[PDB]
């Protein structure tokens, strides 16, 4: 009778995430930023501010930071925007695992929307 989360669809609507990180790193990696292809989270550091928020995951597209639209950002300017966003960082994110999966070898999306790497 357990109720497993792993079969519930991951929400695909945009979300607001507010991370308070003072003057430390946010604790995640981004990929993308080839010509408007999107900026995606590829890795969240265990114990970092992004992990502690509990509200971001690999495969999230970063739509904006502090009101600055990053949908069509280059990866380096995205990184600059994130690193210079200040102590309070307001991210709009949207889970886009299909688009993310193009970047990571042998990765695909299962029926709940989770990214699987074989």
């Amino acid at each position: 009778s357990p109720e497993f989360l792993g079969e519930e669809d991951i929400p695909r609507e945009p979300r607001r995430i507010v991370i308070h990180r003072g003057s430390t790193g946010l604790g995640f990696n981004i990929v993308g930023g080839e010509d408007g292809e999107g900026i995606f989270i590829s890795f969240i550091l265990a114990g970092g501010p992004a992990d502690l928020s509990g509200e971001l995951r690999k495969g999230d597209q970063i739509l904006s930071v502090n009101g600055v639209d990053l949908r069509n950002a280059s990866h380096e300017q995205a990184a600059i925007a994130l690193k210079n966003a200040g102590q309070t960082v307001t991210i709009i994110a949207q889970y886009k695992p299909e688009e993310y999966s193009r970047f990571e070898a042998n990765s695909r999306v299962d029926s709940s929307g989770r990214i699987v790497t074989d």
């Binding site: 790193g25 990696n29 981004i30 990929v31 930023g33 990866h75 380096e76 990184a79």
Partner: peptide
């Protein structure tokens, strides 16, 4: 692909 990856 112009691929790059940054830590933030």
């Amino acid at each position: 692909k112009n691929y790059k990856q940054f830590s933030v």
